[PDB]
Amino acid sequence: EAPNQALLRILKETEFKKIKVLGSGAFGTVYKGLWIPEGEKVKIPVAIKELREATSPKANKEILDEAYVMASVDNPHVCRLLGICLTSTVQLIMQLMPFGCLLDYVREHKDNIGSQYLLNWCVQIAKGMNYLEDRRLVHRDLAARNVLVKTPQHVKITDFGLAKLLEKEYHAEGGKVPIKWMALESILHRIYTHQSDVWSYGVTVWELMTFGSKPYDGIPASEISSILEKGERLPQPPICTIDVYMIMVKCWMIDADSRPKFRELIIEFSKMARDPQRYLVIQGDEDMDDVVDADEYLIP
Ligand SMILES: */C=C/C(=O)N1CCC[C@@H](n2nc(-c3cccc4ccccc34)c3c(N)ncnc32)C1
Numbered sequence: 001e002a003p004n005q006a007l008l009r010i011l012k013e014t015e016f017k018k019i020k021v022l023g024s025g026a027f028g029t030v031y032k033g034l035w036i037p038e039g040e041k042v043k044i045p046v047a048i049k050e051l052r053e054a055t056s057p058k059a060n061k062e063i064l065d066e067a068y069v070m071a072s073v074d075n076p077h078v079c080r081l082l083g084i085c086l087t088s089t090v091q092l093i094m095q096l097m098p099f100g101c102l103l104d105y106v107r108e109h110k111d112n113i114g115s116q117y118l119l120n121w122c123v124q125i126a127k128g129m130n131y132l133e134d135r136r137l138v139h140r141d142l143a144a145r146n147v148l149v150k151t152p153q154h155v156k157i158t159d160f161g162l163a164k165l166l167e168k169e170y171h172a173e174g175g176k177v178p179i180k181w182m183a184l185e186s187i188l189h190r191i192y193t194h195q196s197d198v199w200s201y202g203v204t205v206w207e208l209m210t211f212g213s214k215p216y217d218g219i220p221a222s223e224i225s226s227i228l229e230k231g232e233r234l235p236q237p238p239i240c241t242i243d244v245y246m247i248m249v250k251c252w253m254i255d256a257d258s259r260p261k262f263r264e265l266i267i268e269f270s271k272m273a274r275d276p277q278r279y280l281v282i283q284g285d286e287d288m289d290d291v292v293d294a295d296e297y298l299i300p
Contacts (some may be wrong), residue, residue: 006072010084073131
């Protein structure tokens with residue numbers, strides 16, 4: 001209940017160039033692009049999200065919710081909005097995360113990812129997520145596909161489509177949901193907590209440790225609820241020492257208050273990132289003149 005004084009910045013269509021398409025799908029369309037704030041003498045590499053040319057009234061309501069949330073965050077491990085552009089087709093402008101999402105990155109680079117990288121990513125994500133806990137904000141769709149990569153050393157949490165600002169729970173109408181990342185209480189009772197986000201964290205860590213495997217690859221979504229009730233969980237990844245897998249399993253307790261808190265998760269993975277070969281066992285560990293990254297373009 002502190003007042004949210006974040007500025008929403010509105011961008012003229014003239015200010016930014018679309019260079020190339022990064023992706024299209026359910027979301028709409030994403031472009032690599034370049035932004036020149038007028039009068040400023042900088043050039044900022046950006047990504048631009050347009051809706052799939054939809055003029056739908058529910059669709060504009062959706063991205064403006066996303067815009068809302070993105071505009072209200074400020075953390076090195078969380079993706080922030082740069083601006084919106086109120087063309088007939090509404091556009092979200094954010095920082096360009098050149099290496100795409102982390103899921104695709106671990107897959108593309110399996111044979112070259114060391115323990116130091118994996119554990120540092122885990123730490124960075126726990127930080128992002130802890131920042132969101134401080135801001136009383138529940139992600140609801142944490143997964144490896146929703147973590148973007150600025151550089152291989154630096155990743156940020158994103159996709160706030162489903163993200164909901166809080167007292168101590170959120171209750172939903174189903175829509176579509178990422179069932180395989182969801183806490184049990186969320187599947188059964190449509191309840192979402194920070195601690196429910198921890199479950200999703202667990203599964204995300206698991207996605208990284210298996211270099212992009214699909215959780216429950218075989219199983220149909222309908223089935224999941226029952227399995228977790230039985231007590232089955234995801235398997236221990238080959239690279240994982242018991243110390244690491246233990247932490248994943250703790251994220252997957254039935255009793256959500258018995259799960260760890262992101263602040264604790266930072267600590268554990270930090271200790272592990274200090275001596276990373278003790279905790280993960282992997283074969284082979286061993287014009288642009290005026291360009292400025294978004295993280296150096298502060299405006300107030
Ligand atoms: C593996 C992730 C993935 O498959 N995609 C699809 C290709 C486009 C990728 N992408 N998305 C964003 C992104 C995410 C959330 C919000 C916004 C808002 C405006 C513009 C983009 C986004 C990407 C960004 N910011 N940078 C590079 N690629 C991005 C995700």
